[PDB]
Structures are given as structure tokens and as C-alpha cells.
């Protein structure tokens, strides 16, 4: 594809955790490095909309692009710097919440079925916060 924000959004929607998926999209982004500003902006917006279990993969793409871009120029390293603090903060919180979801679901089952009383369920809930 030619570079466009629509093409990048579609490619990001399909980004998976495979080595090949990350590598392929990284190569395309480097081939269109003149558009590093828009690329990074779209990347950042789509990260935030992504399902919690796909968020780390966005940071892997960043890793790939930033590392592989060094031999071409400092554009991506510089562009990403403006958004990476927010990205890491966001993924840290989300991956935490995401990894606790099965535990919350279990407590919700326990409450629905009165496996224990509400006061004890609340104590368990608090112990994960």
C-alpha cells in the first residue's frame, strides 16, 4: 500500500504477536519513514483503542521500528519519544487490569452463588487493589 492513515489503521488492526506480523509492519513503516509523525500519532491512538491483550504488541512494533530505523535516520526515535511515556504508563495499567480479570470473574461467580457472604467477597476484591 501507499502510506495513508486508513491503510495504517487497517494494518494495525491486524498486528499480531508473531515475529512475522511485527516484522512485516515494521518494514512497511520504515519504507514510509517520511511520514513518521502521522505514523506515530496513529500508532498511539490505535494502541489506546486496542484490546488489552494486544497492547504489548504495539510496544513490540515500536521496538522493531525504532531499532530498525537507526540505520536510516533519527526520525522514528525522535517521534516516538513524545508518546512512549504515555504508552508505557497505559500498557502497564491495562496489562495489570487485564491479568486480574479471571480473578474478578471468579469473585463475581462467588458473589452470584453466595459461595461466601458479601463482606468477605469485598475483602477479596480489596486485596487485589
Amino acid at each position: 500500500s501507499s502510506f495513508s492513515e486508513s491503510a495504517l489503521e487497517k494494518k494495525l488492526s491486524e498486528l499480531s504477536n508473531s515475529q512475522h506480523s511485527v516484522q512485516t509492519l515494521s518494514l512497511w513503516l520504515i519504507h514510509h519513514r517520511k511520514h513518521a509523525g502521522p505514523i506515530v500519532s496513529v500508532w498511539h491512538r490505535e494502541l489506546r483503542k486496542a484490546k488489552s491483550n494486544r497492547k504489548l504488541t504495539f510496544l513490540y512494533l515500536a521496538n522493531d521500528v525504532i531499532q530498525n530505523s537507526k540505520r536510516k535516520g533519527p526520525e522514528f526515535t525522535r517521534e516516538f519519544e513524545s508518546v512512549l511515556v504515555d504508552a508505557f504508563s497505559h500498557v502497564a495499567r491495562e496489562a495489570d487490569e487485564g491479568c486480574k480479570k479471571p480473578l474478578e470473574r471468579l469473585l463475581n461467580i462467588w458473589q452470584e452463588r453466595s459461595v461466601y457472604g458479601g463482606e468477605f467477597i469485598q475483602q477479596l476484591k480489596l486485596s487485589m487493589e
Binding site: N17, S18, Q19, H20, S21, V22, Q23, T57, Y60, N63, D64, Q67, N68, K70, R71
Partner: peptide
């Protein structure tokens, strides 16, 4: 396939 590894780029 292999899952992505972030040490895979050759940048040192």
C-alpha cells in the same frame, strides 16, 4: 510461527 522477540533486530 515464532512469537516476536524484541532482541531480534540486529541493532547493537
Amino acid at each position: 510461527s515464532p512469537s516476536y522477540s524484541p532482541t531480534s533486530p540486529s541493532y547493537s
